[PDB]
Design a protein around this nucleic acid. Structure first.
Ligand SMILES: [Mg+2]
Ligand SMILES: [Mg+2]
Ligand SMILES: [Mg+2]
Ligand SMILES: [Mg+2]
Ligand SMILES: [Mg+2]
Ligand SMILES: [Mg+2]
Ligand SMILES: [Mg+2]
Ligand SMILES: [Mg+2]
Ligand SMILES: [Mg+2]
Ligand SMILES: [Mg+2]
Ligand SMILES: [Mg+2]
Ligand SMILES: [Mg+2]
Ligand SMILES: [Mg+2]
Ligand SMILES: [Mg+2]
Ligand SMILES: [Mg+2]
Ligand SMILES: [Mg+2]
Ligand SMILES: [Mg+2]
Ligand SMILES: [Mg+2]
Ligand SMILES: [Mg+2]
Ligand SMILES: [Mg+2]
Ligand SMILES: [Mg+2]
Ligand SMILES: [Mg+2]
Ligand SMILES: [Mg+2]
Ligand SMILES: [Mg+2]
Ligand SMILES: [Mg+2]
Ligand SMILES: [Mg+2]
Ligand SMILES: [Mg+2]
Ligand SMILES: [Mg+2]
Ligand SMILES: [Mg+2]
Ligand SMILES: [Mg+2]
Ligand SMILES: [Mg+2]
Ligand SMILES: [Mg+2]
Ligand SMILES: [Mg+2]
Ligand SMILES: [Mg+2]
Ligand SMILES: [Mg+2]
Ligand SMILES: [Mg+2]
Ligand SMILES: [Mg+2]
Ligand SMILES: [Mg+2]
Ligand SMILES: [Mg+2]
Ligand SMILES: [Mg+2]
Ligand SMILES: [Mg+2]
Lengths: 95, 148, 103, 26, 140, 190, 97, 14, 166
RNA sequence: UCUCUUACUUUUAACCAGUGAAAUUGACCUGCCCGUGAAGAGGCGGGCAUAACACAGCAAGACGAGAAGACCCUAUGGAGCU
RNA sequence: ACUGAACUCCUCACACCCAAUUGGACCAAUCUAUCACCCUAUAGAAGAACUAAUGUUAGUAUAAGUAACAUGAAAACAUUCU
RNA sequence: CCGAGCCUGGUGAUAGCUGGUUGUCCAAGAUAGAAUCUUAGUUCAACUUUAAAUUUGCCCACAGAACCCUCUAAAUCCCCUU
RNA sequence: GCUAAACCUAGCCCCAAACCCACUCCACCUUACUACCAGACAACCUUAGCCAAACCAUUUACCCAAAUAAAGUAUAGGCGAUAGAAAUUGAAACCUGGCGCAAUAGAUAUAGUACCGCAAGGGAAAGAUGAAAAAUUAUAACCAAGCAUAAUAUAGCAAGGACUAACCCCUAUACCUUCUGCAUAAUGAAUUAACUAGAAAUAACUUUGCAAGGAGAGCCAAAGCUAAGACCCCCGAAACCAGACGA
C-alpha cells in the first residue's frame, strides 16, 4: 500500500477506507450496510430498517483498517457539533 | 518462509486483496463520514476542575485577565494552530466545588460554565481568533523573533 | 566410537586395596593470572579454599605459579607418570573445587 | 590475507604439537 | 570481505580426526567423511541395545550347553532354580558354568530334585509333605 | 554510537562495470543457467547483501536521561573515593613532573580528569603542565560527559565548577515542558 | 589450505592518543551550555545525513534531494536505478503484508 | 524447428 | 616448488666410537624437470628398486625406454659423486635403497578437436629420485615355508582366550 | 543382393618406442535364483556361489552417456499470422 | 514351561528422539570502547558460520598412458634408387 | 544459432514455475470449510505458537430433543455429581 | 617428498574541502596521422517501454529551486492500484577523515592492453626471499585434493558391537530436494580451496526516564509521552521499447 513513499519516505493510506469508514478513538470502526440504497421496492420494512443502521465491524477487519490508515486518522478530534462525540471514549468495559 | 509459493518467493498481493473476490473495503458503499473534516473547527476542552486546579497550584493567576496566552504559558492546555484548533472551549465538567472569582476569555462556553463562573463574581467573554492569530497568541515569542 | 579409539583392561596401578591405599596424585600446578577476568574464580579459590584442600590431604604437593596468562590452567601429575592438564578459564569457585577434588 | 590473530595462534600451537610429536626430545 | 572465516581448518580437523581409520576416500575428503562419521556415530548410539541383547543370548547359549552336558534342559534349569528362591541371573550362571563346574553340577542337581518334587506334587496334589526342597521361606 | 557515520560501500550487481549480455543461451549448451556475468554467484561479481552507502547511527535520548546519567556518574565517582574537589587549580612551578609526582603521592591513579570552567580563566601553569602529558586532561565544564568520566580513573572538579554542575543539573528537575526550544528568551531562563 | 603459517605482526594501539582521550568532549553541551548549540551540530559527515537516521531507501531519497543536483552523471544514474529498485523491493516484495 | 547451439571457445591466454 | 632431496647430502653425523658398527654411506641425488611421464618413469624406478648398481646399469643399458638413458646418466653421476666426495672407496659396492619418481611442473596446450570444441593437453614433466647405500645388496626375503605357516597357526590357536567373561 | 559364403592386398587391428585427448564420474570392498518393495534389486529376506590379479573380444543389464522431451497438459508465461 | 522391546522395575542423573511454523538458552572468526598480554573478559556493530543451487574461479583426479599423431630405402651422409 | 539480426541502455525487466537458502541445544507443534478468470495461487474461517486477565473446561444421570405413511440401527445433543 | 602451501602492498571505496584541464619541432576530417588549387550540402522536433493494477485497453513516483514541519493533509485517480501539493515556519560562517577492503576482496585494470567479434561492442589473469643478490648460503622443515615411499586375500552403503589378532562372528536399504510415499532404476553432486543467499514499516512485548502531562518548536494524550531492543532472501526465462552497427 506504498509502505515507503517515493517523495518523503513515509507510509500512505488507502483513500477508499477514508471514503467508506469512520474510526472511533476507542478502536471501533463504524460502517454502513451494503446495498442500503438499492432495490428498495422489493425489501420488507424490517429489512429496510435493518439496512439503514450505522453498524460496527469485526476485530480482524478493524486491524486491517488500522493497517490501511496512518496515525493521523487515529487521533482525538474535538469537533464543535460532532454527532458521534459520545461514542468516542468507552465506558464500563471489563476485559 | 514455509514451502514454495507466493509465501516463500515473497511476491504476495497487496494489503486488502481477497483473491479476486471484491474486497471488504470495496463492497461497502460510500458515505460522507470524513467529508469536510479539514475545514471543521476544533476546540480544546477545559474543565472547571482543571481551571480550579491550575489556580490552586500556583499556576495562571486570578489577579490578571485570563486569555489564551496565559493558559499556554501555564501549559494548562496545549493548542495546535495547525490541525484546525480555533482556540479553547470552556465546559461545565467541574461546576460544583468551583470557587475562584476570575475573569476569563475563551472561544466557546456552554451556558452552565458561564453561570458557574458568574456565581462566584467573575466575567466570561467569548472571543474569536483566526488561525494566524492563533499561531501568534499561543506562542508570541517565535512571532516576535520573526520580525513582522 | 570404540573402534576408532584405543582401549585398556581394568586394573589397579600397584595393587592399592590389598595393602595400604595411597593417594595417586603427586602435584597440582596452578597458574593464576594477577589481572584478568578469565581467572577470577581461580583467584578466589587461591584466596579461600586451596589452603584447606592442602591440609585435607598432605600427600599432594600444590604449586601456585601466579603468572600473567590469558587462560589459567591446572596441571596434575600422577604417581605412575601420566600428566593430565585441564583448564580453569572462567569458572566459579564451586566448579574449580569439584574439578580439583575429582583430579 | 585473512585478518585476525586467534586462528593463526591456534594453528601455531598445533604445528608445535605435531613438530614435537614427530621428533620427541630426550 | 568483512569478517570472513579464518579457523575453518579446525572444524575440518574436528570432523576428520574421527575418520582416520576409514577405507578409501572417506578418510580424506570432508564431503564424504561428514556422512560416514554421522552414520558411524548413529550406529554407535544404536548398538547399546544390540550389545545387551547379544550378551544375554550368549549367556543363554552357554547355560544351555552346560545344562545339556549335565543331562538337563535350559527351561527346566531356570524354572527350578527360580522355584527354590535362588535368584541368580544369566551372567553369574554362565560364569559358574565356565569357571566353577562343581557348583554348577550342584545347581543342576538342585534343579533336578525340585523338578522331581514338582512331579510328585502334581501326581499327588500334596498329601503329605509338599516336598522338602519346596516350602518357600515367607517374608513379612 | 550517535556520532558514528560508517563510510562502507560495496557495489551491487547493478553498479559493477559491464555484465550486460546473457552468456551461453538458455536451452542449448550443457552448462548452468546464467543471465549475466557480474551476478553475485560469479567471481568478480557484485555483493548481494553488502553495506549500502554512508550510514548514520544518530538517535537522541530524552535530555532528562542524559542529565540523570551525569548525576549517576558523579555519584558513582563520589561513592568510590575517587572524586576530588579543588578550590582553585594553580601550580607553583608548571612542569609536568611536579604534577605526576603529586598525583603519585596523593594516590590518585594513572589517569585523572582535571575540570575547570569557562575555558578562559584556566591558569597558565596547569595548561603548560597538561599540554604535554597524555594521561592528564583539562576540559572546560561545558565539556563534561559520561565517557570521559568512566575512562579516567579519578576526577578533579573546582568549586565554581561544582556549583555550575549543581545548578545546571538541578535545573532539569522542577522544570516545565519545553513548548519551544530553550535557546529562545524564556523570561526566567538566561 | 586457508590458514596462515606464521603468526602476524602484533598490532600495537595507543589508548592514550589525542583522539581516544578526548573522545566525547563537548558532547552533551546543550544541557549545560544553556542550549546555544544542539549535539547534532557536532556531527561531521555528509551534508545530507547530518542528524538524521532514516532507512536505506530514505537515505538515497534524501541524497537525491539535497545533493543530486551536483552529483556525477554515472552516480546520478546509479542512484535513480537504486531508488527505483528499492521502491520495487520495499513496496511489492517481502513478507509481512 | 532446427534446434542447434553454437560452440563456445575459451580465451586463448589460459 | 620444494627442493629437499638436494639438502640431504649436507647432513653431518657426530664421529663414531671405536666399539661401534660401520654406519654405511648414504648418497642422495635427483634430476629435476625431465620431459617424460611419471608412470612410465615409475616402472623403471620399480625395476631398479632393490638391485645392485652394476646389475641396475646392466638392466638399463638394454632397456628400450627414453627414461632408461636418463636414469643411467643419473646413476653414473651418483656413482661418481659417491666415489669422489662421500667417501665410498669401492665403486661396485653400492645398492639402490630408494628410487622413485614425482610429478613436476607442467604446461597446458589446446587439442583442437573435430568441431568448434577442444581439450586441454598437458605437457607433462617429472622428477627422478635415487638413494644409494654402500655395502652388498641385502638378500631378498624368502617365501615363508610350511613350518612357518604351521607355527603361525599354532601360535594363533595358542593366543585365544575365554571371551566375554571374567 | 541371395541360396552360401571363401581367398588375397591396403587401411584398420595386436606387440615395442615417443608425444599424448574427450563425453562420464555420490562413495563402492561392484555375483546368481526366488520373493519383497515408489509396483522391473549387486546393496532388503531365504538359499546358492565365492583365493587375488591383468591382457583380447561381445553388447544382456547398470530403467548406460551427450540435449532442465521436440509427443500430452498447466501458466490470468510469450510470439508469428488472419 | 521357556525365549522374546526404547513397556515396567532395578543403582545413579534427569530440559537432552516429529514435517511447515513458533518460543527460549548459549556460541567461533572480525572491528571498536575499556581490560588483558602464550589469546582472554564485559558491552556495541556487522559483507557475522556451506556435505549440495547441471552455482563462479583455480588445482588435481577417473575415464587413461586409452582414442589419435607422425619419417620412402641404401649410403661416402658427396649421391643413387622406387 | 531470422516467424523476425546484432550491440548497448530501461535491466537486479517479470514470473502463482524449478533449484538453493550456511553454529549448538531444548520445548510446543497435523488441516470442518467458504470465496475467487480459482483449484500449481491468495484472503477469511479451524488448528498450531507466545504473553497476560478471569473462572470454570472435559468425562457426564433422573428429566428432556414434532413427525406419516412400512422397517427405522450403531449413536448423538443437553446434562447436577464424580 | 613431488606437486605444492603462506605472505603485505601495489592500490582501490565512501566523505569533507576546493570549481578542473588541455601547442617542445612535424603530421591529423582525402583511405585521419597524407606540405600545396574554384560549388560554396549542413543543428534547432512530446521519449518510448518493462513493470503494478495479480489480465489489460485511461492510469504506474523518476521531473534536478538545500533540511524539519504542515503531511501523506487538501486534492487527482477503470474515485483503484496508486499519485500528491500549496499558504505558513525556519536552514550557526573555519578545522587534512573512516567500529571501509587487502590480489577469487577493493575500480574491469599491471589494462580498456592481450584476446574475440567486419562493425557497434565484449573483455580477462597475474606479484610475494632478503639490511645487504656487488651474500646464491643451506636450509628451515610441519598442513587440502592427486601420487610415491607402501598393489591385491572369500562377503557385500564400507560402519558399529567387540574381541588376544585387521579380515573371519552379529546388526545395519548413502545425503539433500520435491513428495501421501524415494535405497529406489526421480532430481543434484569427481574431489579440494576461496566466494556465494532475510534489507523495512504501522500496530504490539520488554526495559529505562518523566508524569496529567511527555517530547531539544511541528506531534500525541479520559495513564499517557519519549528512547532502545526485536521482523520480513539468492540465481534463472522466452519477451517489450529506444538509440547505434552491419549487403
Ligand atoms: Mg525449494
Ligand atoms: Mg503449494
Ligand atoms: Mg506478482
Ligand atoms: Mg530383554
Ligand atoms: Mg548493467
Ligand atoms: Mg535474464
Ligand atoms: Mg576482477
Ligand atoms: Mg568486485
Ligand atoms: Mg524380482
Ligand atoms: Mg544402482
Ligand atoms: Mg538414458
Ligand atoms: Mg523440463
Ligand atoms: Mg488460472
Ligand atoms: Mg497473459
Ligand atoms: Mg504481457
Ligand atoms: Mg512484434
Ligand atoms: Mg520409559
Ligand atoms: Mg555478501
Ligand atoms: Mg555471509
Ligand atoms: Mg568450501
Ligand atoms: Mg551435465
Ligand atoms: Mg557446487
Ligand atoms: Mg604406446
Ligand atoms: Mg579402455
Ligand atoms: Mg591406433
Ligand atoms: Mg527475479
Ligand atoms: Mg496457479
Ligand atoms: Mg522439481
Ligand atoms: Mg517435541
Ligand atoms: Mg470474477
Ligand atoms: Mg500488470
Ligand atoms: Mg583484481
Ligand atoms: Mg595429502
Ligand atoms: Mg556380512
Ligand atoms: Mg523404504
Ligand atoms: Mg542442508
Ligand atoms: Mg507422485
Ligand atoms: Mg538415483
Ligand atoms: Mg523432477
Ligand atoms: Mg549427475
Ligand atoms: Mg557485394
Amino acid at each position: 500500500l506504498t509502505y515507503f513513499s517515493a517523495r518523503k519516505g513515509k507510509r500512505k493510506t488507502v483513500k477508499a477506507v477514508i471514503d467508506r469508514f469512520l474510526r472511533l478513538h476507542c478502536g471501533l470502526w463504524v460502517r454502513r450496510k451494503a446495498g442500503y440504497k438499492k432495490k428498495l421496492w422489493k425489501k420488507t420494512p424490517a429489512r429496510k430498517k435493518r439496512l439503514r443502521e450505522f453498524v460496527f465491524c469485526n476485530k480482524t477487519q478493524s486491524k486491517l483498517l488500522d493497517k490501511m490508515t496512518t496515525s493521523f486518522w487515529k487521533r482525538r478530534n474535538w469537533y464543535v457539533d460532532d454527532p458521534y462525540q459520545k461514542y468516542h471514549d468507552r465506558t464500563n468495559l471489563k476485559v | 518462509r514455509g514451502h514454495k509459493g507466493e509465501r516463500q518467493r515473497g511476491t504476495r498481493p497487496r494489503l486488502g486483496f481477497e483473491g479476486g473476490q471484491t474486497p471488504f473495503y470495496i463492497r461497502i458503499p460510500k458515505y460522507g463520514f470524513n467529508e469536510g473534516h479539514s475545514f471543521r473547527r476544533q476546540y480544546k476542552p477545559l474543565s472547571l476542575n482543571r481551571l480550579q486546579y491550575l489556580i490552586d497550584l500556583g499556576r495562571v493567576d486570578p489577579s490578571q485577565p485570563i486569555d489564551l496566552t496565559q493558559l499556554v504559558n501555564g501549559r494548562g492546555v496545549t493548542i495546535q494552530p495547525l490541525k484546525r484548533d480555533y482556540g479553547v472551549q470552556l465546559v461545565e465538567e467541574g461546576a460544583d466545588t468551583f470557587t475562584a472569582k476570575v475573569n476569563i476569555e475563551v472561544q466557546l462556553a456552554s451556558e452552565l460554565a458561564i453561570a458557574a463562573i458568574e456565581k462566584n463574581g467573575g466575567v466570561v467573554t467569548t472571543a474569536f481568533y483566526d488561525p494566524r492569530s492563533l499561531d501568534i497568541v499561543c506562542k508570541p515569542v517565535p512571532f516576535f523573533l520573526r520580525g513582522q | 566410537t570404540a573402534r576408532g579409539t584405543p582401549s585398556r583392561f581394568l586394573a589397579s596401578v600397584l595393587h592399592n586395596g590389598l595393602g595400604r591405599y595411597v593417594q595417586q596424585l603427586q602435584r597440582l600446578s596452578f597458574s593464576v593470572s594477577r589481572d584478568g577476568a578469565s581467572s577470577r574464580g581461580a583467584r578466589e579459590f587461591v584466596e579461600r579454599e586451596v589452603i584447606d584442600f592442602a591440609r585435607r590431604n598432605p600427600g599432594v604437593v600444590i604449586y601456585v605459579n601466579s603468572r600473567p596468562c590469558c587462560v589459567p590452567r591446572v596441571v596434575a601429575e600422577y604417581l605412575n607418570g601420566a600428566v593430565r592438564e585441564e583448564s580453569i578459564h572462567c569458572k566459579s569457585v564451586e566448579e574449580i573445587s569439584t574439578l580439583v577434588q575429582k583430579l | 590475507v585473512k585478518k585476525g590473530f586467534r586462528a593463526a595462534f591456534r594453528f601455531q600451537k598445533e604445528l608445535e604439537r605435531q613438530r614435537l610429536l614427530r621428533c620427541p626430545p630426550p | 570481505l568483512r569478517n570472513r572465516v579464518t579457523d575453518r581448518y579446525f572444524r575440518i580437523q574436528e570432523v576428520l580426526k574421527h575418520a582416520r581409520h576409514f577405507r578409501g576416500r572417506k578418510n580424506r575428503c570432508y564431503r564424504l567423511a561428514v556422512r560416514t562419521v554421522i552414520r558411524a556415530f548413529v550406529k554407535c548410539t544404536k548398538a547399546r541395545y544390540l550389545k545387551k541383547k547379544n550378551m544375554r543370548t550368549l549367556w543363554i547359549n552357554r547355560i544351555t550347553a552346560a545344562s545339556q552336558e549335565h543331562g538337563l534342559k535350559y527351561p527346566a534349569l531356570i524354572g527350578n532354580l527360580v522355584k527354590c528362591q535362588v535368584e541368580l541371573n544369566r551372567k553369574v550362571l554362565a560364569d559358574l558354568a565356565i569357571y566353577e563346574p562343581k557348583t554348577f553340577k550342584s545347581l543342576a542337581a538342585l534343579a533336578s530334585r525340585r523338578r522331581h518334587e514338582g512331579f510328585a506334587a502334581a501326581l499327588g496334589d500334596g498329601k503329605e509333605p509338599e516336598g522338602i526342597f519346596s516350602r518357600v521361606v515367607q517374608y513379612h | 554510537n550517535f556520532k558514528r557515520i560508517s563510510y562502507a560501500k560495496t557495489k551491487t550487481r547493478a553498479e559493477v562495470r559491464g555484465g550486460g549480455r546473457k552468456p551461453w543461451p538458455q536451452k542449448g549448451t550443457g552448462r548452468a543457467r546464467h543471465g549475466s556475468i557480474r551476478s553475485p554467484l560469479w567471481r568478480g561479481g557484485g555483493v548481494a547483501h553488502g553495506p549500502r552507502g554512508p550510514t548514520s547511527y544518530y538517535y537522541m535520548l530524552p535530555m532528562k536521561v542524559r542529565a540523570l546519567g551525569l548525576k549517576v556518574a558523579l555519584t558513582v565517582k563520589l561513592a568510590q573515593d575517587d572524586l576530588h574537589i579543588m578550590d582553585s587549580l594553580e601550580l607553583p612551578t608548571g612542569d609536568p613532573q611536579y604534577l605526576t609526582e603529586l598525583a603519585h603521592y596523593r594516590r590518585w591513579g594513572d589517569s585523572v580528569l582535571l575540570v575547570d570552567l569557562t575555558h578562559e580563566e584556566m591558569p597558565q601553569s596547569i595548561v603548560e603542565a597538561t599540554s604535554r602529558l597524555k594521561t592528564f586532561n583539562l576540559i572546560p565544564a561545558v565539556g563534561l560527559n559520561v565517557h570521559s568520566m568512566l575512562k579516567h580513573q579519578t576526577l578533579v572538579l573546582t568549586l565554581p565548577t561544582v556549583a555550575f554542575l549543581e545548578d545546571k543539573l538541578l535545573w532539569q528537575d522542577s522544570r516545565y515542558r519545553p513548548l519551544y526550544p530553550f535557546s529562545l528568551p524564556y523570561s526566567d531562563f538566561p | 589450505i586457508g590458514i596462515r603459517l606464521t603468526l602476524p605482526p602484533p598490532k600495537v594501539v595507543d589508548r592514550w592518543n589525542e583522539k581516544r582521550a578526548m573522545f566525547g568532549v563537548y558532547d552533551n553541551i546543550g544541557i549545560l551550555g544553556n542550549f546555544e548549540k544542539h549535539p547534532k551540530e557536532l556531527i561531521r559527515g555528509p551534508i545530507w545525513l547530518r542528524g538524521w537516521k532514516g532507512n536505506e531507501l530514505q537515505r538515497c531519497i534524501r541524497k537525491r534531494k539535497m545533493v543530486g543536483s551536483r552529483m556525477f552523471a554515472d552516480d546520478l544514474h546509479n542512484l535513480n536505478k537504486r531508488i527505483r529498485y528499492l521502491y520495487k523491493h520495499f513496496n511489492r516484495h517481502g513478507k509481512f503484508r | 524447428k532446427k534446434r542447434f547451439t553454437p560452440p563456445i571457445y575459451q580465451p586463448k591466454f589460459k | 616448488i620444494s627442493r629437499k632431496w638436494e639438502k640431504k647430502n649436507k647432513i653431518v653425523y657426530p664421529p663414531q666410537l671405536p666399539g661401534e658398527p660401520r654406519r654405511p654411506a648414504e648418497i642422495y641425488h635427483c634430476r629435476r624437470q625431465i620431459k617424460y611421464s611419471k608412470d612410465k618413469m615409475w616402472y623403471l624406478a620399480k625395476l631398479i628398486r632393490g638391485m645392485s648398481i652394476d646389475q641396475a646399469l646392466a638392466q638399463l643399458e638394454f632397456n628400450d625406454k627414453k627414461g632408461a638413458k636418463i636414469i643411467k646418466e643419473v646413476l653414473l653421476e651418483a656413482q661418481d659423486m659417491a666415489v669422489r666426495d662421500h667417501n665410498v672407496e669401492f665403486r661396485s659396492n653400492l645398492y639402490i635403497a630408494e628410487s622413485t619418481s614425482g610429478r613436476g611442473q607442467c604446461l597446458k596446450r589446446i587439442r583442437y578437436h573435430g568441431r568448434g570444441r577442444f581439450g586441454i593437453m598437458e605437457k607433462v614433466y617429472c622428477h627422478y629420485f635415487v638413494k644409494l647405500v654402500e655395502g652388498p645388496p641385502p638378500p631378498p626375503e624368502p617365501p615363508k615355508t610350511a613350518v612357518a605357516h604351521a607355527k603361525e597357526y599354532i601360535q594363533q590357536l595358542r593366543s585365544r582366550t575365554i571371551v566375554h567373561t571374567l
